[PDB]
């Protein structure tokens, strides 16, 4: 069925929040004895040509 919510952004995040989240999560990967709680509910998707140039300039 047609709906307005198909054509809207479903997940949004700001610059500072994304940068702080990435820095904190990288600091968490620095320690191998520290593991996340409820990792399935965390936005982990955000965390996770010389040959072409030469061929373009000289075929």
């Amino acid at each position: 069925e047609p709906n307005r919510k198909w054509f809207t952004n479903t997940r949004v995040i700001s610059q500072d929040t994304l940068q702080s989240f990435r820095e904190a999560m990288a600091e968490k990967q620095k320690d191998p004895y520290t593991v996340l709680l409820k990792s399935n509910k965390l936005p982990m998707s955000l965390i996770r040509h010389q040959a072409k140039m030469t061929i373009e300039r000289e075929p």
């Binding site: 990792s39 399935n40 982990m44 998707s45």
Partner: protein, 65 residues
């Protein structure tokens, strides 16, 4: 959608397991259920994590998670 997976050692098998024959997205941080308790089997070879998504106005195709 589902095919019947037969289990047991007798000639008369049990047929409660269903295997998904179409591609699936199992989700993030997915660990398979114990074999005694999984009914719906989603094989590893049919799991996709990226798709070739085309932007309609930009007319470009990119591989997105």
């Amino acid at each position: 959608m589902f095919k019947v997976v037969k289990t047991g050692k007798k000639t008369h098998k049990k047929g409660w397991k269903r295997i998904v024959t179409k591609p699936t997205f199992v989700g993030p941080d997915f660990t398979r259920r114990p074999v005694k308790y999984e009914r719906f089997i989603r094989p590893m070879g049919l799991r996709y994590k990226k798709a070739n998504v085309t932007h309609p106005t930009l007319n470009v195709t990119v591989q997105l998670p």
